[PDB]
Amino acid sequence: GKSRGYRSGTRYAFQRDFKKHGAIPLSTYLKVYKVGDIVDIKANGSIQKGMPHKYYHGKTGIVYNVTKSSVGVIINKVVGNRYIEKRVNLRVEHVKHSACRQEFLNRVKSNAAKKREAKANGETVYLKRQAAKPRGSRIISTEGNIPQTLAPVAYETFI
């Protein structure tokens, strides 16, 4: 007999972290979520109300609705050959702000500051990020660092 219940296969996914069982620290209940916020979804096993389905465990989405104890999150799920918009109601214990926003918003602030200061100094600045480039030429000093010659070692048994 096959079993395909709601929480099938969530034995380790919905477990609490080792030595992290019990009461929820209240910064979880003090965070503020607004419509449009990007939030990660991670089911907390100790709160069984408002719990996400196992598909959304590990997914990141957009807050679209704010209720008394919960947020509505928009997820895009692949169903066959396209994506379907899913609207999941989650209690805030299963939700955390996504850290990718604060990094991109910081690059936006930094670009605005650099551009305005470069305009003040009358020069130009290039704001596009660059991939790591091959390193340039260089001279390696050998004072105190004369090359040491290595050789492959013979075979030995150590048991």
Binding site: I140, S141, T142, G144, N145, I146, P147, Q148, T149, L150, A151, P152, V153, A154, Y155
Partner: protein, 171 residues
């Protein structure tokens, strides 16, 4: 293969913690510098916590034979893998170049032990200065005084398919 001896020098990439990492040199017998730098990283990752991604090649130089027209005897110390285990061995070769002795070694372990290039580590190639350093008789027999030998049964190669005279093998 047809090989050259290379001096490959490399190091770990400098860090703010360690701005002058130690330089390591290896003598590599490779057909070209692409295999020379590959073999270098192959042995450094067997001997040090380093990778090609976290390291840097500093120098690749050909090491030419000092006396390419002086007949020498070389002792080569090897570490090769067989079908069953891993073995150390020492063998001797007569040649005028160190590279040509290593080339003979690779042919010889291919012929006598079915050991491919990938299964062989050259631990050491040493030119034996003293005649007493020669341990193996198959090369010790050419260090005798006033060595002479004929070449009986000479076979002459013909340009034509048919020959009008009886073959001979004098020489």
């Amino acid at each position: 293969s047809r090989l050259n001896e290379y001096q490959v020098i490399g190091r770990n990439l400098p860090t703010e913690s360690v701005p002058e990492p130690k330089l390591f040199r290896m003598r590599i017998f490779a057909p070209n510098t692409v295999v020379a730098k590959s073999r270098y990283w192959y042995f450094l990752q067997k001997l040090h916590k380093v990778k090609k991604a976290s390291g840097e090649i500093v120098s690749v130089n050909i090491i030419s034979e000092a006396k390419p027209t002086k007949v020498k005897t070389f002792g080569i110390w090897l570490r090769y893998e067989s079908r069953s285990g891993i073995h150390n061995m020492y063998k001797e070769y007569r040649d005028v170049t160190r590279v040509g002795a290593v080339e003979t070694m690779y042919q010889d372990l291919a012929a006598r032990h079915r050991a491919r290039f990938r299964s062989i580590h050259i631990l050491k190639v040493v030119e034996l200065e003293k005649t007493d350093d020669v341990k193996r008789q198959y090369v010790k027999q050419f260090l005798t005084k006033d060595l002479k030998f004929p070449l009986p049964h000479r076979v002459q190669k013909s340009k034509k398919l048919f020959q009008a005279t009886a073959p001979t093998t004098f020489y």
